[PDB]
Amino acid sequence: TNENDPAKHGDQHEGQHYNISPQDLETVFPHGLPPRFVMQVKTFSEACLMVRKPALELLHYLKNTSFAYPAIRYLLYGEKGTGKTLSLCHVIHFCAKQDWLILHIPDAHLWVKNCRDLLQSSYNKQRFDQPLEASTWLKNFKTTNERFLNQIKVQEKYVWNKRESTEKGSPLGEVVEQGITRVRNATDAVGIVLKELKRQSSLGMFHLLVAVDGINALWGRTTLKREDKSPIAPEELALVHNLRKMMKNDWHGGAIVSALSQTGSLFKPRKAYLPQELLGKEGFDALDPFIPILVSNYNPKEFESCIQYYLENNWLQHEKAPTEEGKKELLFLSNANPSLLERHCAYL
RNA sequence: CCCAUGAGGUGGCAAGAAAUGGGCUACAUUUUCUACCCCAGAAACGAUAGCCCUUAUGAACUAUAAGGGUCGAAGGUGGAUUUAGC
Ligand SMILES: Nc1nc2c(ncn2[C@@H]2O[C@H](COP(=O)(O)OP(=O)(O)OP(=O)(O)O)[C@@H](O)[C@H]2O)c(=O)[nH]1
Numbered sequence A: 001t002n003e004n005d006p007a008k009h010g011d012q013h014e015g016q017h018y019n020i021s022p023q024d025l026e027t028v029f030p031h032g033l034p035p036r037f038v039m040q041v042k043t044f045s046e047a048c049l050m051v052r053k054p055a056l057e058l059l060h061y062l063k064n065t066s067f068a069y070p071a072i073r074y075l076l077y078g079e080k081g082t083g084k085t086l087s088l089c090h091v092i093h094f095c096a097k098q099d100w101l102i103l104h105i106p107d108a109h110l111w112v113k114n115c116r117d118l119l120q121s122s123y124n125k126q127r128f129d130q131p132l133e134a135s136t137w138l139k140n141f142k143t144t145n146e147r148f149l150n151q152i153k154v155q156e157k158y159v160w161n162k163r164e165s166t167e168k169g170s171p172l173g174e175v176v177e178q179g180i181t182r183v184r185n186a187t188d189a190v191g192i193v194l195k196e197l198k199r200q201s202s203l204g205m206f207h208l209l210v211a212v213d214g215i216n217a218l219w220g221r222t223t224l225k226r227e228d229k230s231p232i233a234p235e236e237l238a239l240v241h242n243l244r245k246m247m248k249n250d251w252h253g254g255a256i257v258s259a260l261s262q263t264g265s266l267f268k269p270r271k272a273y274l275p276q277e278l279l280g281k282e283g284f285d286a287l288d289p290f291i292p293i294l295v296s297n298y299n300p301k302e303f304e305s306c307i308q309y310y311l312e313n314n315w316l317q318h319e320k321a322p323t324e325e326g327k328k329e330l331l332f333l334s335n336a337n338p339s340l341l342e343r344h345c346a347y348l
Numbered sequence B: 001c002c003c004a005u006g007a008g009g010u011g012g013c014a015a016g017a018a019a020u021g022g023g024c025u026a027c028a029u030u031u032u033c034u035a036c037c038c039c040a041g042a043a044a045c046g047a048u049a050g051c052c053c054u055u056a057u058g059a060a061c062u063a064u065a066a067g068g069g070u071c072g073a074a075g076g077u078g079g080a081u082u083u084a085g086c
C-alpha cells in the first residue's frame, strides 16, 4: 500500500503509494494538475502518489538515456480517464529530484481556447497576442523555479518599447519581472525566453526538460474568431507559432514529454484516444518518430491496493461497502477506469 | 334580380387611441457560450421587436419567408381565480 522510498522506485512491488512533501507540492508542480484533483488532494491533506507500470517504464527510459543522442520525444496516451498526466507529473517529480531545469505547462487547451482578450504584436507582424496567459505562465515558471533564473546568463540583449533594454550577462529573472509588471508584452517576453532556453546549446550548467499536457490542443484549429467575423488559424497565434517553431529536437540535450487529453479536445469526437487520431496528419509531420506510451487501466492488485489506500484514508464512509459484493459491483461498474473510480469513491 | 341583386378588367381594401383570448420567448445560474451529446473550460441572462443589408420564389419584396451588422429594454417567475394530466 504505502511506500517509504518516494524518489527511487522498483517494479517488484507494484500498486504501492509513496508520500510527498508540501514544498514538493507547492514548488515543483503548483499548476500542473486538474483543479478537481488539486482540490481532491487538498481535501486529502495527505499527498501520496501511486506507482504505475508505464510510469516505471518511462523512468527506466530516463535512467538509460544519453544526452549526446538527439532530444528524445515521449507521448503519453490513454483512454480518456487513465493516469497519463499524473504519471507525467511523476516524471516531473523524478526529474526535479534529479535537479533538471523543468518547464511544465498546465494545458494547451487553455492557450488555444478561452482567451479573454486575443492584438497586433509589435515584436513581430501577422501575429495575435496572448498577454494574460503569457504573464500567467511566466509567473508560473517563476514559482516553479530560482538559482536557474539567476545563473541562466543570457548571452544576448533585448530592447523593449518601454524606453528600456536588457543587456548581456543579466539573469532572465529581470525579464520575468518585466512580464509580471506589465502583461502587454508578456507574450513577447515568453516567446523570447523560450528561444533563450535553446540559445544555450551546451546545456552543461543545467539539463532542459519540457512537460506538456493536452498536447492535442497544440495541433488543431482554434475556436476564436476575428472581430470581422472571420476564423483564426492556430499557427497565427503568438504562443502557438512560438512553441511550434521552438520544440524541434534541435537542442539535443535530453528529453521532452507530452500527454494527450480528450476531455478537452475540440472539434473531435468522443471515445477517440488513438495518438494518430488525436495529433492528426500535421502532428505526424511535425514529429514522425516518437515514443508512444499506452497508459492502460488499473491492474487487479493495483486496484485492490488503491482500495486499501482509500480504506486507510477512511474515504468511503459507507461502511457496508468494504465487502466482497460491494467491491465486485464497484469494479464491475468501474471497469478499472481511474477517473470514474475516483468519482465513484468520491460520491460513495 | 332576370340592363342585374348577373357577368367581364384596373386599383386599393386588409391599420390600430384601445380591451381580451390561445401559443412562442425568456425573467437564471437545472441559466448562457465553446468541441463532443454528457467526466471539460469560462460568463454571470432576455429581440422570432425596430433600422440597414444579403438570400428563396414570384412578373411584383415598402415588405412575404430565411440569414448577417446594430439596437441589448420590458422582464427579477405572476392581481383574484383557473386549466391539463394516473
Ligand atoms: N492516486 C493515483 N490516482 C490515479 C493514478 N492514475 C490515475 N489516477 C486517477 O485517475 C484520474 C485521471 O488522471 P488524469 O491523468 O488527471 O486524467 P487525464 O490524463 O487528464 O484524462 P483526460 O484529460 O480526461 O483525457 C486521476 O484524477 C486519479 O484520480 C495514479 O497513478 N495514482
Ligand SMILES: [Mg+2]
Binding pocket: B057, B058, B061
Ligand atoms: Mg419574390
